[PDB]
Design an enzyme around this catalytic site. Structure first.
Site, PDB file in Angstrom:
ATOM      1  N   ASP A   1       1.179   7.941  13.715  1.00  0.00           N
ATOM      2  CA  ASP A   1       2.507   8.458  14.056  1.00  0.00           C
ATOM      3  C   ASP A   1       3.107   9.054  12.799  1.00  0.00           C
ATOM      4  OD1 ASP A   1       4.504   5.349  13.802  1.00  0.00           O
ATOM      5  OD2 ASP A   1       2.568   5.831  12.931  1.00  0.00           O
TER       6      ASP A   1
ATOM      7  N   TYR B   1      10.065   5.409   7.012  1.00  0.00           N
ATOM      8  CA  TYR B   1      10.826   4.482   7.858  1.00  0.00           C
ATOM      9  C   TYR B   1      10.478   2.998   7.658  1.00  0.00           C
ATOM     10  CZ  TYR B   1      11.882   8.959  10.003  1.00  0.00           C
ATOM     11  OH  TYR B   1      12.311  10.259  10.186  1.00  0.00           O
TER      12      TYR B   1
ATOM     13  N   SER C   1       8.123   0.057   4.615  1.00  0.00           N
ATOM     14  CA  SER C   1       7.077  -0.266   3.654  1.00  0.00           C
ATOM     15  C   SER C   1       5.919  -0.945   4.353  1.00  0.00           C
ATOM     16  CB  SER C   1       7.624  -1.188   2.578  1.00  0.00           C
ATOM     17  OG  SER C   1       8.334  -2.243   3.184  1.00  0.00           O
TER      18      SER C   1
ATOM     19  N   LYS D   1       3.695  -3.322   8.714  1.00  0.00           N
ATOM     20  CA  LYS D   1       4.817  -2.465   8.366  1.00  0.00           C
ATOM     21  C   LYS D   1       6.131  -3.159   8.677  1.00  0.00           C
ATOM     22  CE  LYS D   1       5.181   2.173   9.320  1.00  0.00           C
ATOM     23  NZ  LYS D   1       5.437   3.450  10.103  1.00  0.00           N
TER      24      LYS D   1
ATOM     25  N   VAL E   1       0.805  -1.233   0.000  1.00  0.00           N
ATOM     26  CA  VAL E   1       0.000   0.000   0.000  1.00  0.00           C
ATOM     27  C   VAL E   1       0.839   1.285   0.000  1.00  0.00           C
ATOM     28  CG1 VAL E   1      -2.098  -1.096   0.905  1.00  0.00           C
ATOM     29  CG2 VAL E   1      -0.504  -0.011   2.485  1.00  0.00           C
ATOM     30  N   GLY E   2       2.155   1.141   0.136  1.00  0.00           N
ATOM     31  CA  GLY E   2       3.077   2.271  -0.033  1.00  0.00           C
ATOM     32  C   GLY E   2       4.190   2.364   0.998  1.00  0.00           C
ATOM     33  N   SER E   3       4.722   3.575   1.172  1.00  0.00           N
ATOM     34  CA  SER E   3       5.802   3.845   2.133  1.00  0.00           C
ATOM     35  C   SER E   3       5.332   4.764   3.271  1.00  0.00           C
ATOM     36  CB  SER E   3       7.011   4.463   1.421  1.00  0.00           C
ATOM     37  OG  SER E   3       7.572   3.548   0.498  1.00  0.00           O
TER      38      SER E   3
HETATM   39  C1  LIG Z   1       1.540   6.569  17.542  1.00  0.00           C
HETATM   40  C2  LIG Z   1       0.364   7.490  17.886  1.00  0.00           C
HETATM   41  C3  LIG Z   1       0.706   8.937  17.570  1.00  0.00           C
HETATM   42  C4  LIG Z   1       1.792   9.471  18.491  1.00  0.00           C
HETATM   43  C5  LIG Z   1       2.263  10.814  17.943  1.00  0.00           C
HETATM   44  C6  LIG Z   1       3.774  10.957  18.069  1.00  0.00           C
HETATM   45  C7  LIG Z   1       4.379  11.077  16.674  1.00  0.00           C
HETATM   46  C8  LIG Z   1       5.894  11.308  16.835  1.00  0.00           C
HETATM   47  O1  LIG Z   1       6.471  11.995  15.691  1.00  0.00           O
HETATM   48  C9  LIG Z   1       7.543  12.741  16.292  1.00  0.00           C
HETATM   49  O2  LIG Z   1       6.884  13.647  17.254  1.00  0.00           O
HETATM   50  C10 LIG Z   1       7.818  14.518  17.914  1.00  0.00           C
HETATM   51  C11 LIG Z   1       6.958  15.264  18.881  1.00  0.00           C
HETATM   52  O3  LIG Z   1       7.426  14.954  20.194  1.00  0.00           O
HETATM   53  C12 LIG Z   1       8.562  15.403  16.894  1.00  0.00           C
HETATM   54  O4  LIG Z   1       9.404  16.367  17.555  1.00  0.00           O
HETATM   55  C13 LIG Z   1       9.386  14.492  15.948  1.00  0.00           C
HETATM   56  O5  LIG Z   1      10.048  15.260  14.934  1.00  0.00           O
HETATM   57  C14 LIG Z   1       8.501  13.416  15.278  1.00  0.00           C
HETATM   58  O6  LIG Z   1       9.363  12.436  14.686  1.00  0.00           O
END
Ligand SMILES: CCCCCCCCO[C@@H]1O[C@H](CO)[C@@H](O)[C@H](O)[C@H]1O
Ligand SMILES: O=C(c1ccc(CSc2nc3ccncc3[nH]2)cc1)N1CCC(Cc2ccccc2)CC1
Ligand SMILES: CCCCCCCCO[C@@H]1O[C@H](CO)[C@@H](O)[C@H](O)[C@H]1O
Ligand SMILES: CCCCCCCCO[C@@H]1O[C@H](CO)[C@@H](O)[C@H](O)[C@H]1O
EC number: 2.7.11.24
Length: 335
Positions: free
Chosen positions: A163, A30, A32, A48, A27-29
């Site tokens: 995330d 740290y 795949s 993933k 379905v696509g793309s």
């Molecule tokens: C997994 C459920 C969602 C959780 C959200 C966190 C996503 C993390 O993503 C990160 O968040 C940090 C914020 O502290 C940023 O400073 C970073 O650059 C980033 O990589």
């Protein structure tokens, strides 16, 4: 009992997965991601495969961080883990990490498609983001890059915060745009307001063409810093520049969002304040009368506290690798 695995080569890479996971499709793309079918639960899943997880200290640290966050996140509107596995029979051969979660199937562009949603639909979607943000923020986590592609949606418009998802600056708070380094949780509230606006109007709120155009567009709507806000600027240069600016008045949102529910407008005025200290929180937004049909103060759960000092250590690769390994082992699937 260690499950039986099988190999397969997808999208030009080998994938080793337990037998329960059938019909792998990219379905696509740290990493795949494949869609697959989980014969054990009967659920369609996204799987993933982490990209080069233990190749550098930085990759190893990130793998450990992603694994730890996802294992912590246990909430309806936040992506979590259905499974985590490795082919590895021991730490010595540990070199790959696979993550498993519900297949949502769409993000908040596939579901929206540049059109106006109804007010009812908007309420439902924003309520869900905020319910998930409340959870996230109570663990003392700021998302920092909330955008439609970081929001997974299924057919029934049930939504989860991602995330990392599969124009990327349109949803950023002004203070992130300006590389401030003391963000507060309401950087995410800003992003929610931009998203809400667009769902109501069918149009990107601030479609800057570049970095500066974005900030121009934000100032047009919210105005230039007032005096209380200037007092909080430690940078003399930032300060000087803002003071050189010709005071611009905050627009009336009832004129920007023509014909929208007046509660939606009121809510947008509380999300989209220049001064982040004055933005409504996610907990407060959930109590706003706009979400009356969906708000339930007894089912808006909060997270256990999350130790993020564990992920910002300076460890050797084999130490991160070993710590990540124990996380795989310790994983208990949800009920
Ligand atoms: C997994 C459920 C969602 C959780 C959200 C966190 C996503 C993390 O993503 C990160 O968040 C940090 C914020 O502290 C940023 O400073 C970073 O650059 C980033 O990589
Ligand atoms: O359902 C989806 C999904 C979204 C958009 C499309 C349109 S193409 C297709 C599918 N996702 C997106 C990302 C996925 C990765 C992941 C993240 C964490 C752990 C495992 C896998 C989890 C949920
Ligand atoms: C000229 C454009 C002005 C941009 C000003 C951004 C205002 C954001 O607001 C500011 O957020 C900071 C960073 O989180 C906090 O330290 C401040 O308390 C808060 O007022
Ligand atoms: C928090 C305030 C950040 C300062 C933003 C810098 C704005 C740069 O923006 C540019 O400024 C140049 C000289 O100032 C001019 O040539 C342009 O008119 C302007 O686009």
């Amino acid at each position: 009992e260690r499950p039986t695995f099988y190999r397969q080569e997808l999208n030009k890479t080998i994938w080793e997965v337990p037998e329960r996971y059938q019909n792998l499709s990219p379905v696509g793309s740290y990493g795949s991601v494949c869609a697959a079918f989980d014969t054990k639960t009967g659920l369609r899943v996204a799987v993933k495969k982490l990209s080069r997880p233990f190749q550098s200290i930085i990759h190893a640290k990130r793998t450990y961080r992603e694994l730890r966050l996802l294992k912590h996140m246990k909430h309806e509107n936040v992506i979590g883990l259905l499974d985590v596995f490795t082919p590895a029979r021991s730490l010595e051969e540990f070199n790959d990490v696979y993550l498993v979660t519900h297949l949502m199937g769409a993000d908040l562009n596939n579901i929206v498609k540049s059109q106006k949603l109804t007010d009812d639909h908007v309420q439902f979607l924003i309520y869900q983001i905020l319910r998930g943000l409340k959870y996230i923020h109570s663990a003392d986590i700021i998302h920092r890059d909330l955008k439609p592609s970081n929001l997974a949606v299924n057919e029934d418009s049930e939504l989860k915060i991602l995330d990392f998802g599969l124009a990327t600056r349109w949803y950023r708070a002004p203070e992130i745009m300006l590389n401030w380094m003391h963000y507060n949780q309401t950087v995410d509230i800003w992003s929610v307001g931009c998203i809400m606006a667009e769902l109501l109007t069918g149009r990107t709120l601030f479609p800057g063409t570049d970095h500066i155009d974005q900030l121009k567009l934000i100032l047009r709507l919210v105005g230039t810093p007032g005096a209380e806000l200037l007092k909080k600027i430690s940078s003399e240069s930032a300060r000087n520049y803002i003071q050189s600016l010709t005071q611009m008045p905050k627009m009336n949102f009832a004129n920007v969002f023509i014909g929208a529910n007046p509660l939606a407008v009121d809510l947008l005025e509380k999300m989209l304040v220049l001064d982040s200290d004055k933005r409504i929180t996610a907990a407060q937004a959930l109590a706003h009368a706009y979400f009356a049909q969906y708000h339930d103060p007894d089912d808006e759960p909060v997270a256990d506290p999350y130790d993020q000092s564990l992920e910002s250590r300076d460890l050797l690769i084999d130490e991160w690798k070993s710590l990540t390994y124990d996380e795989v082992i310790s994983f208990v699937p949800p009920p």
